[PDB]
Amino acid sequence: ENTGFETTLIKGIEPIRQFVLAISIYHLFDTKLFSLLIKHEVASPEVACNELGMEKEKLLGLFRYLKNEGILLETIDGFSLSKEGHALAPFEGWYVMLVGGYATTFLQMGERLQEGAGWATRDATKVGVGSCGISHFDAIPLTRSLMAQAPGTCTKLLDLGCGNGRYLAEFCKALPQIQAWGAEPDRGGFEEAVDLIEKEGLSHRVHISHSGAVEFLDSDFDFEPDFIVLGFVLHEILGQAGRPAVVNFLKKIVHRFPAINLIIIEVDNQFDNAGAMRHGLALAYYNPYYLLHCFTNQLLVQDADWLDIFAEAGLSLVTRETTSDQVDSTGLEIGYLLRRA
Amino acid sequence: ENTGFETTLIKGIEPIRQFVLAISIYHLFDTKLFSLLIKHEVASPEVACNELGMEKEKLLGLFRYLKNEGILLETIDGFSLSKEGHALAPFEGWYVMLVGGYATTFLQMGERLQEGAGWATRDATKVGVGSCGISHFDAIPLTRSLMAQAPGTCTKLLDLGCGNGRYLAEFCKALPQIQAWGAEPDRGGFEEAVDLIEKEGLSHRVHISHSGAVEFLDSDFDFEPDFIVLGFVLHEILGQAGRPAVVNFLKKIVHRFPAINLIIIEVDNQFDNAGAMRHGLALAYYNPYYLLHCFTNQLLVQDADWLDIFAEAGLSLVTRETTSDQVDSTGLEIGYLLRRA
Ligand SMILES: [Mg+2]
Ligand SMILES: [Mg+2]
Numbered sequence: 001e002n003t004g005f006e007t008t009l010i011k012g013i014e015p016i017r018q019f020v021l022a023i024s025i026y027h028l029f030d031t032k033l034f035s036l037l038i039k040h041e042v043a044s045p046e047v048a049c050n051e052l053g054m055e056k057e058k059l060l061g062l063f064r065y066l067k068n069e070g071i072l073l074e075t076i077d078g079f080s081l082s083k084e085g086h087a088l089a090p091f092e093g094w095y096v097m098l099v100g101g102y103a104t105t106f107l108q109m110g111e112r113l114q115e116g117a118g119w120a121t122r123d124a125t126k127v128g129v130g131s132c133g134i135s136h137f138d139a140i141p142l143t144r145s146l147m148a149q150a151p152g153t154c155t156k157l158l159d160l161g162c163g164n165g166r167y168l169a170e171f172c173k174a175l176p177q178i179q180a181w182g183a184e185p186d187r188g189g190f191e192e193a194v195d196l197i198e199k200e201g202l203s204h205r206v207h208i209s210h211s212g213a214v215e216f217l218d219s220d221f222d223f224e225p226d227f228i229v230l231g232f233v234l235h236e237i238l239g240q241a242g243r244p245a246v247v248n249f250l251k252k253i254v255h256r257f258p259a260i261n262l263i264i265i266e267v268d269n270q271f272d273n274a275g276a277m278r279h280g281l282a283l284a285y286y287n288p289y290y291l292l293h294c295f296t297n298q299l300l301v302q303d304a305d306w307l308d309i310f311a312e313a314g315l316s317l318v319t320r321e322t323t324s325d326q327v328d329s330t331g332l333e334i335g336y337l338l339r340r341a
Numbered sequence: 342e343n344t345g346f347e348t349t350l351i352k353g354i355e356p357i358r359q360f361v362l363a364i365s366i367y368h369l370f371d372t373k374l375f376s377l378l379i380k381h382e383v384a385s386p387e388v389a390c391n392e393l394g395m396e397k398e399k400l401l402g403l404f405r406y407l408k409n410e411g412i413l414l415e416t417i418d419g420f421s422l423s424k425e426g427h428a429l430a431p432f433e434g435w436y437v438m439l440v441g442g443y444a445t446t447f448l449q450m451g452e453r454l455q456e457g458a459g460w461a462t463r464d465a466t467k468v469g470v471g472s473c474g475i476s477h478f479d480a481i482p483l484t485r486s487l488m489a490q491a492p493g494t495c496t497k498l499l500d501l502g503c504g505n506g507r508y509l510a511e512f513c514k515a516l517p518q519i520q521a522w523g524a525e526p527d528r529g530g531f532e533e534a535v536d537l538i539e540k541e542g543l544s545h546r547v548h549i550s551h552s553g554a555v556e557f558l559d560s561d562f563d564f565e566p567d568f569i570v571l572g573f574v575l576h577e578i579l580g581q582a583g584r585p586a587v588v589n590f591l592k593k594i595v596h597r598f599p600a601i602n603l604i605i606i607e608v609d610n611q612f613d614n615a616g617a618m619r620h621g622l623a624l625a626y627y628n629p630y631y632l633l634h635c636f637t638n639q640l641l642v643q644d645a646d647w648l649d650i651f652a653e654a655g656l657s658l659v660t661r662e663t664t665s666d667q668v669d670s671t672g673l674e675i676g677y678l679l680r681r682a
């Protein structure tokens with residue numbers, strides 16, 4: 001008879017309902033429909049189609065789906081973002097990083113679980129673009145706070161793994177004397193960085209290279225930085241190349257630039273910490289982030305493990321801070337300001 | 342200052358938290374880890390790895406992620422499904438169909454919105470396997486109810502678009518005199534059907550063909566069915582081949598088999614119906630289902646549109662029913678029992 005089945009089904013597939021909604025919100029941002037709705041206020045499918053080069057019947061389908069979920073309103077004049085839709089605006093970076101960048105990674109987990117199946121791949125351009133959007137709220141303010149605590153003033157900034165160059169665009173706008181260099185290994189991300197720097201009118205002060213971190217430090221670049229920022233880059237090197245390679249990379253930075261100030265941002269691996277994992281943001285963001293990092297060739301370690309790598313590399317801790325508790329109060333995102341020992 | 346941002350972020354990315362959970366629940370079923378946990382009760386990662394040929398560190402990552410979400414329990418002896426994990430068991434078909442089958446389809450929507458970009462693709466094997474799992478609850482009981490209302494007893498059953506052959510396996514077990522034939526166009530689904538029929542010991546009574554519906558009816562098969570089941574197949578033909586092709590296909594069925602009883606199951610397209618779309622199941626399942634059908638080459642129409650196609654094909658409605666209100670009370674899944682006019 002299946003007595004009471006429907007009520008259990010509606011609850012049982014609530015993760016699928018939200019799965020489709022998350023992908024649909026990601027497309028709303030990524031296709032530039034969200035920005036179109038912000039600019040137009042109300043747009044007919046015909047107007048949105050003409051502007052973005054889209055097909056009306058498919059756009060109507062997406063719009064009707066979002067209207068049923070309350071993200072859009074529909075009037076005789078067309079569609080608009082509802083208050084709930086407008087409220088999604090600050091979270092674009094998270095949708096672009098985790099859906100755009102990592103949907104394929106999560107979908108590959110079943111196959112990648114097999115012995116010898118290798119690491120899950122990702123869309124590194126979207127990971128970089130999304131992570132740079134997120135960084136406006138957490139990592140850039142943390143980097144700024146640590147930079148201000150350093151004894152020397154920043155004049156020549158090097159950002160390795162710069163994504164779309166958001167840290168450099170923000171820092172250079174705020175601090176007009178700075179000359180900067182960024183390196184980004186993903187071609188798509190590198191091209192977005194070159195474009196963002198040009199759009200911000202910073203091309204005369206900021207140069208971007210298409211390069212990985214280790215290979216950039218081995219290259220024959222002429223820059224003499226006094227600050228180097230390593231935002232979530234060391235855990236990539238640690239997984240890909242190993243702990244000796246991370247220690248050697250850090251040793252090379254202070255051998256080449258003995259007076260340099262290093263700012264490292266890392267995620268403390270507390271995936272196995274009961275209390276930490278009950279925090280709302282630990283569940284919403286860090287639990288999927290830790291899962292991705294078991295399937296990709298990156299390795300997250302604990303705060304104590306990073307401090308031990310820094311000591312082995314001959315670095316001294318100046319200060320360590322976490323993000324503002326107004327944005328992320330988990331204590332899992334840690335920033336370190338270091339100097340040569 | 343970003344005052345109060347974190348609280349808004351946790352709510353703002355709740356769809357992403359559930360997006361990752363839905364994919365992870367899908368892998369738990371699809372990889373056979375869910376069945377392993379049911380059989381073992383408690384399993385160490387080492388034991389699960391040896392049985393399924395998996396890598397321990399990746400499995401531990403998935404298990405830790407699911408434990409943090411409350412799907413698994415961890416003791417010194419290993420991992421087990423929690424009560425919440427056990428409660429997911431009946432919903433396997435929905436995860437396999439919508440995540441396994443259609444995740445790629447949803448992820449393709451951004452690109453497919455572009456003028457001339459074509460139809461989004463899907464993993465038809467997983468769509469078929471998942472939809473057959475769902476059919477145990479809604480469409481098979483509906484088909485059984487309509488068959489019982491037909492004047493003649495079923496002796497030779499033809500099921501077009503049979504997926505993994507679940508309708509035939511269920512009907513033939515319940516009704517021992519039946520000879521049956523199934524046709525499934527997806528090779529993966531066809532192979533699963535051949536295997537399920539063999540596993541159920543029905544190979545002497547049930548034959549499966551790797552064929553689409555229209556091409557099967559045009560073939561030189563020797564079967565003389567007295568019942569034909571078209572479960573969610575006509576909307577595929579309607580989208581792919583057009584309304585005249587659907588009318589012609591139905592006309593061919595009753596020209597070849599004048600005394601045949603047809604059972605058609607369709608989804609009423611009420612995507613634009615305010616009241617219908619507020620039902621919990623309309624939001625959880627039908628709203629994503631309607632969205633997929635705007636991006637794939639299938640077309641959902643309304644109950645009245647199907648009745649008009651049946652009249653044009655020279656068919657008479659014997660009776661029409663919806664699914665049991667214990668499983669799906671939306672009224673959107675409609676079954677029709679037809680005969681030649
Ligand atoms: Mg990372
Ligand atoms: Mg890893």
Ligand SMILES: [Mg+2]
Binds near residue numbers: 576639
């Ligand atoms: Mg369909």
Ligand SMILES: [Mg+2]
Binds near residue numbers: 634635636638639640
């Ligand atoms: Mg269609």
